[PDB]
Amino acid sequence: AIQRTPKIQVYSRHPPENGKPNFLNCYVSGFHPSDIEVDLLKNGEKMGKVEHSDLSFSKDWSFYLLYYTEFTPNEKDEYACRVNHVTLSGPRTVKWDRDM
Amino acid sequence: AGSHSMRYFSTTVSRPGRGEPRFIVVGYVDDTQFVRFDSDAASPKMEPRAPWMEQEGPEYWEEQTRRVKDAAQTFRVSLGNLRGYYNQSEAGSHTLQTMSGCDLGPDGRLLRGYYQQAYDGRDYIALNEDLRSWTAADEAAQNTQRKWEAAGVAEQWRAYLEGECLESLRRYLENGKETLQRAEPPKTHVTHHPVSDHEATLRCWALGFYPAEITLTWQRDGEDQTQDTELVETRPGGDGTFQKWGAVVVPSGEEQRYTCHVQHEGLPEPLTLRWEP
Ligand SMILES: CCCCCCCCCCCCCCCC(=O)OC[C@H](O)CO
Ligand SMILES: [Zn+2]
Ligand SMILES: [Zn+2]
Ligand SMILES: [Zn+2]
Ligand SMILES: [Zn+2]
């Protein structure tokens, strides 16, 4: 079996503005096999009501998924995505950068 | 657009001791998902995943459900067969992926038909472009090739890919035209973030575009800095659109020697952008 490590991007749907409702996205891609754990985190805590896209894959057979939830960003709050996969030594946490 | 595609992507994953393999299939027209099936759902059936699909009547959904359940049974059998071909234990989970579908060219004919499989993330077997022959990726897959050659499988796929596959694609393009036939150009802008007193990150953004295909390249003195550019994978907005950015770190005094070039279907002319303080 050829295994592949997930790529991870954490970002918002629309340009973030404090006080305005928005969507927080965690796009994981390029991984194999398909079993994967993905959490969206608010100040280190797992957010509820996180949905995800239907499992699909790319030309090279690697899988991708979008995990997403409503959020309203501000100055106070820190957001992140934590991903676990058999290819990782432990979960990988990527912080939300409002400029990426 | 002049050309369009339809694809079905199925994933079958065994789980020894925990019941039958899980089966998921998703359908896309171009970069737009339009259906799904998940064997682990409460009452598994093919379901719409685009609003324009909701107008298909109940007999459409019943037939698609019948077809995916039939495919699922064959893929569970295949998993068994392949476990044997590779001399593998019954203890481990394995994955069978399939892709099938058709590209419609501007002459209204089949540009390319596909039917191919992967086992544990590696190429296994693929229908060739002539839709009359197979490529096996290894010796084990030659077992499958021999059986499919004897059973006339390629001709069955040829008939589907040149007929119903395209007929369905044409119908979806009509029913979904307001969104499927609309090329949404990227909203673009350049941001600037000092990383020191002497250098800054120039980031070129493309947002809200459809379809996903796009080119985003930073230029300096009219050629591309592909090696000094951080270019992220094109990513979904979650609203049916896509996003991408590319960034370079440059000396403060050379900032205006940099331009970002953006090409996309929905743009009349390619954009050349710059940091506009
Ligand atoms: C195929 C990649 C994923 C596989 C998951 C299975 C469902 C895909 C088919 C969806 C039903 C509508 C099209 C039916 C295709 C079909 O009729 O089969 C072809 C030839 O007829 C073979 O004989
Ligand atoms: Zn078109
Ligand atoms: Zn041999
Ligand atoms: Zn910047
Ligand atoms: Zn200095």
Side-chain angles (χ1 to χ4, degrees), chain B:
Chain B
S3 305
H4 291 276
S5 60
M6 179 174 71
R7 295 284 188 275
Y8 287 88
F9 300 115
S10 79
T11 303
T12 305
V13 180
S14 62
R15 41 187 169 198
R18 293 188 289 149
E20 293 224 304
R22 190 190 184 172
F23 182 58
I24 301 171
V25 64
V26 296
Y28 283 81
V29 174
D30 298 323
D31 297 317
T32 298
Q33 193 188 342
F34 71 103
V35 286
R36 74 169 171 204
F37 175 95
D38 180 356
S39 67
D40 272 3
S43 284
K45 53 184 74 285
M46 188 79 102
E47 295 182 319
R49 293 289 277 158
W52 45 266
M53 280 300 298
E54 288 173 35
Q55 71 196 98
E56 296 285 358
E59 290 296 326
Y60 169 85
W61 298 104
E62 290 169 31
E63 173 66 12
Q64 296 298 302
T65 295
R66 182 194 73 75
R67 293 184 181 187
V68 297
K69 286 188 182 183
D70 174 70
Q73 296 293 73
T74 70
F75 294 148
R76 296 185 178 112
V77 166
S78 295
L79 274 176
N81 292 0
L82 268 59
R83 191 209 58 87
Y85 304 155
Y86 287 108
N87 191 18
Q88 289 167 334
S89 161
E90 303 229 273
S93 174
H94 298 274
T95 299
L96 174 65
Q97 289 162 275
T98 77
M99 181 275 271
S100 69
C102 45
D103 294 347
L104 175 68
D107 64 349
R109 285 174 183 78
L110 178 66
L111 191 49
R112 221 288 207 191
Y114 308 85
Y115 179 61
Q116 45 199 247
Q117 300 196 136
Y119 182 64
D120 289 332
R122 285 191 290 261
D123 283 339
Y124 184 74
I125 198 174
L127 185 61
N128 291 324
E129 177 159 1
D130 57 17
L131 308 181
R132 287 173 201 290
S133 62
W134 305 93
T135 298
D138 61 30
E139 288 188 61
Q142 295 182 317
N143 291 304
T144 298
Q145 173 169 6
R146 281 187 290 278
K147 292 198 316 218
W148 290 4
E149 272 169 359
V153 172
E155 167 67 13
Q156 293 172 345
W157 277 95
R158 180 220 52 88
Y160 166 76
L161 294 165
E162 289 179 348
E164 185 186 19
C165 189
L166 289 180
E167 288 159 3
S168 294
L169 175 53
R170 290 184 191 103
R171 182 176 72 257
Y172 303 148
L173 286 169
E174 179 59 30
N175 289 351
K177 66 173 173 261
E178 280 79 7
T179 50
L180 297 172
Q181 295 279 20
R182 166 59 196 254
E184 288 286 353
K187 299 163 289 264
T188 55
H189 71 287
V190 174
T191 60
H192 164 280
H193 281 106
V195 295
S196 70
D197 296 340
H198 301 279
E199 291 179 296
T201 307
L202 305 184
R203 184 167 285 109
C204 184
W205 287 88
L207 295 170
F209 56 93
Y210 183 90
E213 166 57 42
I214 195 169
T215 57
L216 193 164
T217 64
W218 272 107
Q219 293 153 302
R220 179 215 180 200
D221 293 329
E223 65 171 319
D224 294 345
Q225 318 286 135
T226 323
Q227 315 327 129
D228 291 25
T229 305
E230 185 180 7
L231 185 65
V232 296
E233 202 169 61
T234 302
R235 68 203 191 184
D239 55 354
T241 70
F242 296 86
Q243 306 180 354
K244 195 188 193 64
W245 58 253
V248 285
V249 179
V250 306
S252 298
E254 288 185 359
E255 286 179 29
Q256 302 305 326
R257 298 173 56 181
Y258 282 84
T259 54
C260 193
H261 203 65
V262 178
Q263 178 63 296
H264 186 269
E265 273 187 26
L267 294 173
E269 301 298 336
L271 298 160
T272 295
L273 307 92
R274 80 176 43 258
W275 171 229
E276 303 175 336

Side-chain angles (χ1 to χ4, degrees), chain A residues 4 11 29 32 54 61 100, chain B residues 33 49 97 121 123 233 236:
Chain A
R4 270 149 278 166
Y11 56 104
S29 63
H32 215 289
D54 303 321
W61 305 105
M100 287 179 46
Chain B
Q33 193 188 342
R49 293 289 277 158
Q97 289 162 275
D123 283 339
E233 202 169 61

